[PDB]
Symmetry: C2
């Protein structure tokens, strides 16, 4: 067997710099010639957005940003964009905010400039998500990928240490799960490793100093590369487990990713030796699980799903819904029984080494 | 002085696999619905181009491929494209073949599927070149970036070892110069280092066995990442020198790049510590230069520009033409004297360490 892969590199501009968001946005809106800019920021994020968009003229400030992007919310937002003749969408915030921008792009094909404030990386994917009648639906479309991403670490400094850490490990999970993702390839693999390197350097710095320019820059850069890698490599076992835990059991997104990650690594590591070594090298340790555990310890990462309401009684259904979602090419064959044992370890915070 | 950059990730699909070019081309043409394909290949690659396009219908076979892409040759190719209502360009061959496809796309906006047979990496850049009125210039245009690249190392099995080595070192130069390029950033940096790793591994395996699938795949993969890095980082000192030597003195392309590289590395290394350490790590050696020198010895690399007819009497002019083209941000300040000394070293193949 010789090297074989099919890789898609997605078009995107990335403007990166502490304190430069308002100046970058001005430059981008000038470069584009946009006449009617729509700023999307959650009601609680909206004062920051005003400061970020201070150097441009804004036609509409839209603050109905809602988790899981309900279709009626997306419908109202499309109407505002359409009724106001908007020609540029600008989103300032996290996944739900970027998610609303995406939902508008789906039907309007309006371009998006994303100005993210967390490490979830939705700005780097062509994946959209909608909820309608308690049913979440997703898809892929180049129209939903932001054309430009403006990363300004100053905008992430008010994110509390615990949430910053949780969110950073969500980004780290985009990197690690992608190393054995359904469409893993050498390119998305190098980018995932670089993401691990950056997040591993940045997150301890954030814990020690939440206004660390160096550390917040490393984390935000790392989150970017994590997401770009994930958009190419596709969702692996980790993301399928978390999809279920969030979708069926409504557990908190970031903390769930944070908690599930080390168990999936331990579960798959033995059967994905090349991924394991690359991750190891990115952490600067002999093994990847050692790298992750040390980081988790230094960062006081989440340890148990039971701390977010998940019970042992919910593992049967958890396994039941996820099992079919798992990629056929997951390094280690997944079974109802070994997926149940993984969730038991993540539920109660056992040593992940137990799943090796 | 915190991290700041503006990075353009260019859209591209890359399909990779020994023996798969004809099946990939079929897939690509069918996915596009293309009805009037034009295959571009020099006479010496036409037999091979016919085999590569054996699973598709080809409207036009065009073999007028000429080094430096004369404007008259570009103009004839564009007319064939337009007269025949061509809807897809497919190029099979090296730099000059890909160069002609690019020249056609400049005016027609036709998409290009590139099927490369060397390591020059033109298939991964948005750089075009034309020669008009005895003057060669290059420019940038997104329309010239091939939308898809098909890498099939079977098509490189017959590439002679000397050309393979010289062209591979051309690819290596794309990586190394990009490390201190005018728009060097952390992303093109990590890609450049991945290119160094792949080429350093691959080229010696090709010299050891010209039909090594492992080595041929590594070189081709390396060449891709080198060029993607370079498309982003822009032309640094090395490329400016080589452009002058190829344009004004008509020195052979791959050999000139191969020969000049160690001298530009030796010259800039001390003033680019972060770049030097990254290259060193990629080579797996203590310094970047010893890594490059070990590679060069192991592949019997080109040694001196005098082997291609360059003479000392031409250095003053080379320097004249190049000095003003050097990026203001080159690591070591470039003077008329030290650029002359650099070219004297390359002329006679002196120990590159003479420039450290």
């Amino acid at each position: 067997n010789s090297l074989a892969f099919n890789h898609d590199t997605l078009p995107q501009k990335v403007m990166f710099g502490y304190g430069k968001s308002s100046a970058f946005l001005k430059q981008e809106v000038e470069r584009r010639g946009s006449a009617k800019v729509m700023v999307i920021a959650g009601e609680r994020e909206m004062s920051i957005a005003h400061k970020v968009a201070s150097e441009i003229e804004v036609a509409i400030w839209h603050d109905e940003v809602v988790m899981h992007v309900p279709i009626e919310v997306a419908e109202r937002a499309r109407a505002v964009a359409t009724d106001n003749e908007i020609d540029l969408l600008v989103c300032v915030g996290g996944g739900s905010t970027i998610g609303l921008a995406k939902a508008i792009a789906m039907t309007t094909a309006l371009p998006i400039v994303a100005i993210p404030t967390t490490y979830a990386g939705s700005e780097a994917t062509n994946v959209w998500g909608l909820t309608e009648a308690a049913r979440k639906t997703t898809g892929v479309d180049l129209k939903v990928l932001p054309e430009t991403v403006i990363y300004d670490s100053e905008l992430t400094m008010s994110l509390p240490v615990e949430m910053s850490v949780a969110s950073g490990l969500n980004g780290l999970a985009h990197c690690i799960d992608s190393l054995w993702g359904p469409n893993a390839d050498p390119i998305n693999a190098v980018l995932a490793a670089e993401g691990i390197r950056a997040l591993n350097q940045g997150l301890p710095k954030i814990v020690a100093n939440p206004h660390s320019i160096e550390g917040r820059d490393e984390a935000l850069y790392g989150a970017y590369l994590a997401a770009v890698s994930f958009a190419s490599a596709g969702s692996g076992l980790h993301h399928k487990i978390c999809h279920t835990l969030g979708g069926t059991f409504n557990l908190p997104h970031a903390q769930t990713h944070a908690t599930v990650l080390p168990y999936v690594l331990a579960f798959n590591a033995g059967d994905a030796p090349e991924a394991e070594r690359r991750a190891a090298a990115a952490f600067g340790t002999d093994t990847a699980l050692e790298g992750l555990q040390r980081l988790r310890l230094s960062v006081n990462a989440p340890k148990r799903l039971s701390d977010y309401g998940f019970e042992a009684s919910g593992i049967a259904e958890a396994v039941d819904v996820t099992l079919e979602k798992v990629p056929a090419n997951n390094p280690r064959p997944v079974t109802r029984e070994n997926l149940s044992r993984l969730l038991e370890a993540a539920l109660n915070g056992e040593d992940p080494a137990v799943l090796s």
